[PDB]
């Protein structure tokens, strides 16, 4: 079985691999961002949005990955191995769902094709400041 | 942040720890069950149910756990370690979402309190055949 | 003062001594049926039913008895055997009756305790071998 | 599962810790206060106030562990003068709270636990000698 | 800029100087009077009475200078038994005034500070031994 | 008891720890923005806004700390360094947040603290060099 996690939300894995690899903030910055303004919404008993159902499983599954790393740390390249390949897939899943909740789903998707083509023009022919999605 | 994965669906972790530990079928039996009759629904681009959004993330996160186990198998108690503690949490998440999709959400929740009290009566004072939820 | 514990719920102890001593599940499996099915109503800041108020006092009465069991073990064996088995049967049938009045409803349990009475009093030569099962409808 | 026995009645166990441990009358004085006032109502088969359900259970729980004090006495002390002192103190707080909530009303006892809070908190040079008594 | 912390609540700091400096209960007795009564209301994200805003700030200002007493203790006394005695007295007047204005109402505390004025002013031969207590 | 200082105003400390330590002006320039713009409302005998009640307690909490700084200097250096710089950053972001909720309005600040969050978390290679400025409309 092959299923993209972003497929119902209107994006792809390729369109999330369209941004650079080190554009996404770290997991500590992203988890504190969700814990900043989405604690009373994520820990609600009733689900509000399909982003909320996907984000409850993104945090819990990364919790299972971290306690697997501390267990294998006791019994440290393997704790560094998870942040290379398994760590990119959780940052992209966290950044996409946090930003779609704050700003909007279609606003993130239009930003992904805007920052993707901004990073792939020559510097002397593009707007100099990098595009950042923001409120107002 | 502390969030149960079953909290929006009307259950708890305790009510899923109400059944015995080895009641749940293995991950191979459960993944082939979802691949049996939910391939054209889970791999749809549009999300149908909150069980579908939770089940797309249950399969993908267990995929990240298995390739972590083959990587640490190369670089085998650790491949057996994941099936003791990290393996119960994925079987319960797979069994709850497969059975709620087939039969119904409230039918699984009424079955959980039915099989829970069936296993906790003396044998001579209970119905002899174990309760199994089934169609018709 | 000789109070009947569940006289106000439509039963007696004499109606509920008909069940055998091995009819009730153990206190661990009885507290788990209370904790797993409905702890949100037991920890609630209001009293939903008179079974709930009787169930909050019944759990904490057993918890005080379990404090006495570890105290006589650590500080200061037959008395641990006494709380678990002799005074525990009064907690088990108190926990069973209040859980079952909330799961299946109260009138279902009281009609079951009569229909167990016609089964447990007949000699074994003239009764069906399976005991009557408790279930709604 | 840690239940507060008074939480349904509007008082926490922390709010009832305003009263000192040696404030409460003896269990013999509390049971005769019950037997003189509420003997028909406690032994009736009729449903009553939720203090009545908690008062039938608190007397019988004391009665169950009264026979434990009788049984441990002959069959061999330090235990019999522990079971009514330390473990019977939780009966005294439970018997005092339900006798007084039936007689003087519930909300007056909630106003009494606060008004005993301001009495026991004040320094000895500025507190009245009249300890607050509960009267009607 | 010299602000009165009580001026918005109808009392001046001169009017609250009727009460003696050793009248006020200790800060440990005031915080448990808050924690037993108002723990849900203080920690709620909902706007409440203007005593609640001043009570969240008075606890956290005491909490900030509580860590100052911890930090000055090891890192080197006279300072740690000055910061809770002299500088913590302004907390005790601020914690007493807002606990009592929430429980007994605001105008009763304004009527209590005046009625404690006539008690402490009278000569010792003509004053009642009952210091005025605040009850409901 | 673990109280959040501005939970009731629509924020957290975790939402407001995203700003750097050098984002806030010093306590002298923060008290002057309170004293010069509106001291008539801070010295007023009524509470206009819940930011005003939180601002009266925040100024006098710092004034008590400045009394401790001169007392440890005159009577009885690293502890003067501690109040000014380590516990002063908790006063600076408390003074900044309540002043800005009264100047620009509260919803403007909370939408600014999110939009600073998307700026401060991105790496410097992919963010514009100027930080987002706070202003109404």
Residue numbers in the entry:
A (entry chain C), B (entry chain C): 111 to 185, 198 to 258
C (entry chain A), F (entry chain A): 111 to 186, 198 to 258
D (entry chain B), E (entry chain B): 111 to 186, 198 to 257
Paper text:
Here we describe an alternative form, termed N-VelcroVax, a VLP vaccine platform assembled from a monomeric HBc protein (N-anti-SUMO Affimer HBc 190) with the Affimer inserted at the N-terminus. HBc protein monomers comprise either 183 or 185 amino acids and dimerise to produce structural subunits which assemble to form icosahedral VLPs with T = 3 (90 dimers) or T = 4 (120 dimers) morphologies. The dimeric assembly results in the formation of 4 helix bundles (spikes) which project from the particle surface and a sequence at the tips of the spikes comprises the major immunodominant region (MIR). The VLPs effectively bound SUMO-tagged Junín virus glycoprotein, gp1 as assessed by structural and serological analyses.
N-VelcroVax VLP samples were vitrified for cryo-EM data collection. This confirmed two different sizes of icosahedral particles. Reconstructions of each particle stack with icosahedral symmetry imposed revealed that these corresponded to T = 3 and T = 4 configurations, as expected. Interestingly, both reconstructions (resolved to ∼3.5 Å and ∼ 3.3 Å, respectively) showed continuous densities located between the four-helix bundles on the surface of the VLPs. Each of these densities was of appropriate dimension to accommodate an Affimer and was located close to the residue at the N-terminus of a wt HBc 190 monomer, as expected. Unstructured internal density was also observed, possibly representing non-specific binding of nucleic acid derived from the E. coli expression system. Processing of cryo-EM data yielded density maps for T = 3 and T = 4 VLPs resolved to 3.0 Å and 3.5 Å, respectively. Initial inspection of density maps revealed no additional density attributable to bound SUMO-gp1, although there appeared to be a subtle change in the orientations of the Affimers, with these being closer together in the N-VelcroVax:SUMO-gp1 complex map compared to the unliganded N-VelcroVax map. However, for N-VelcroVax, in which Affimers are attached at the N-terminus and spatially constrained between the four-helix bundles, Affimer density was resolved. This suggests that the Affimers in the N-VelcroVax system are more rigidly constrained in their position compared to when presented at the MIR region.
